[PDB]
Amino acid sequence: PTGLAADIRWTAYGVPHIRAKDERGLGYGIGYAYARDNACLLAEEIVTARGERARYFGSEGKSSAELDNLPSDIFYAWLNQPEALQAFWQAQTPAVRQLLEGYAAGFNRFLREADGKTTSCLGQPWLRAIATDDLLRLTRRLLVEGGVGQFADALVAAAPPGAEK
Amino acid sequence: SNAIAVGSERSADGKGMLLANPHFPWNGAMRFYQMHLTIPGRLDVMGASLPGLPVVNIGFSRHLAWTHTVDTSSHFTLYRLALDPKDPRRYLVDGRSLPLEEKSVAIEVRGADGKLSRVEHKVYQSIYGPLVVWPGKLDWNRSEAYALRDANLENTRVLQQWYSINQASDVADLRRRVEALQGIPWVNTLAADEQGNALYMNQSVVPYLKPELIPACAIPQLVAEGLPALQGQDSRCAWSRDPAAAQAGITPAAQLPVLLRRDFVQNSNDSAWLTNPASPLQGFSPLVSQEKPIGPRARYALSRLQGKQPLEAKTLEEMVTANHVFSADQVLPDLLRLCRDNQGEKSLARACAALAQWDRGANLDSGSGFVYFQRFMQRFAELDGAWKEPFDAQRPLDTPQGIALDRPQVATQVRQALADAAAEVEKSGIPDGARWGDLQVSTRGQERIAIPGGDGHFGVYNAIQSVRKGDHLEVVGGTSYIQLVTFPEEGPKARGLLAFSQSSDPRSPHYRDQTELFSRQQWQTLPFSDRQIDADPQLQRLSIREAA
């Protein structure tokens, strides 16, 4: 009966003011408003955080963090393994789960209806419906920016010695 | 990132005031986005957030404003492993040989032909975390390897933490909420409230070692070089447990720097030490905060903040919009003296003229002196003992200063550095008469918008980082979300800009509008109350719903 609902006002420069009666509806408004302005950005960064850059863009490209696509993918595939996402989700409060559920729904609602007015990547195969796991992937990517994220190339490069002298 | 919080004892109105000036990328996964969130009766907060996060990261509410700066604390440790001499895939802990774990990741790769191929790659892991290699420094040979333990990998509290901050009423409340959860990954927090409290917190997620463990568990040569490296062959060098900490192995909130004052607190990415020099923060773990010389941005801020005169909103605003290159205060007077001592040196003529005319700023209209100065400073910074007054721990706000021109060796080397810098600049294709704004730009469609500001390492508070792209310097990061908050009777007054504009999409009406304003350094109101929002002539509204 209640579901997801949000009221959005935009003031000068396109700043959204989102009103809702709960976290789910709040997330809904945030995801919708953000998609209107930045759907392609989020879709690209989700591809990165899923470790699927080489799959869509090949090995000769880089992420927006200027890591090569294949080493980036190996790193985020390692970072965002299913067990790790599951554990992170399980540890979330109802409020935060609801924020994330709403955000994904609102982003996806914009995507369903978009006709390109503010979205340049319409029709690209990497522009697609997102899930709460994708938002967890982004969160964990930002989480480690002050730690192992700074060693992503170094992690990929780590292999035992052979028989050298 | 810069941040300044001002309290009742120094603000012109006797209330709290906060300048937020984070320096972050202009593209990608850390591109700030403005939004205002309201659940009537229990949440009402406005500010900016990072992509994908359903919370406000830097912002304000009815009685409180807060922001963040990247801290100097370590949020991981390296462990040096002692490898089993029989097997480089095994390592020794307490004299016992343990196997590395191997986990393969499978990646799909799109080829030339457009077909997908599968790549399988082994990621080796120790009890501490994954192995890492920096060739020539952190190798994996038959004797040693390095593993990395990231303290935030187990921080499941990070979203909850800003959800909680978003609900904070005042500075005291904010402090309770942060110390309770300890979910902040790697930034300081600075805040001010209407009652006139100014708060600094170095409250983040930091590996914990009990004091008596640190001399024994450190790798001396690596920590001396800035790496948080520990002895991985001793089980006693595991991160220490304290039941008071919100996460096993991290530093409890009571042992992390906090300063609550009514005059001011500031940070520009140095340690907690000189947040406010009248009350230095010392005596913390080296993993947390150390007494190191402060950078020129903080030194600049302190030079404006110290004293007895009231601080106005316009004062804090103009600390950003002045674009003053504070590093020039330290070295340009003596550099100009050197110039005057070397008239007749034809090669130095243009450079010395430019440096002399220069307004010592990174403004759009600042002359070529800025470019000459940058190239010189880059070379100056690699000279040895060229400061007239070296860093002095008892005078950390006023040192280093000046050039040691009375030492013949220094004089010769500095002149050479200027000579070298001059030739480099003149070797570039930059037309005579060019000003800084002609060079540093942000591209929007077919236009290049001139962007004021310059690199933080030269002491420009309005820090802007650029890279060469063809004939120009393209901005990649720096001043981003700007928020300046005061608390007049009617409600919070917030002023600022999102420098790169709301939308990354060229199709958007909000792709370049704030960027043009940033170019002109014209900050704007951030409407927060229903009355402010309704006063907006361009107000748009949409209500949306769908079944769950």
UniProtKB/Swiss-Prot annotation, chain B:
Location of the active site: 1 (nucleophile)
Domain of life: Bacteria
Stated name of the protein: Acyl-homoserine lactone acylase PvdQ subunit beta
Native source organism of the sequence: Pseudomonas aeruginosa (strain ATCC 15692 / DSM 22644 / CIP 104116 / JCM 14847 / LMG 12228 / 1C / PRS 101 / PAO1)
Organism lineage string: Bacteria, Pseudomonadati, Pseudomonadota, Gammaproteobacteria, Pseudomonadales
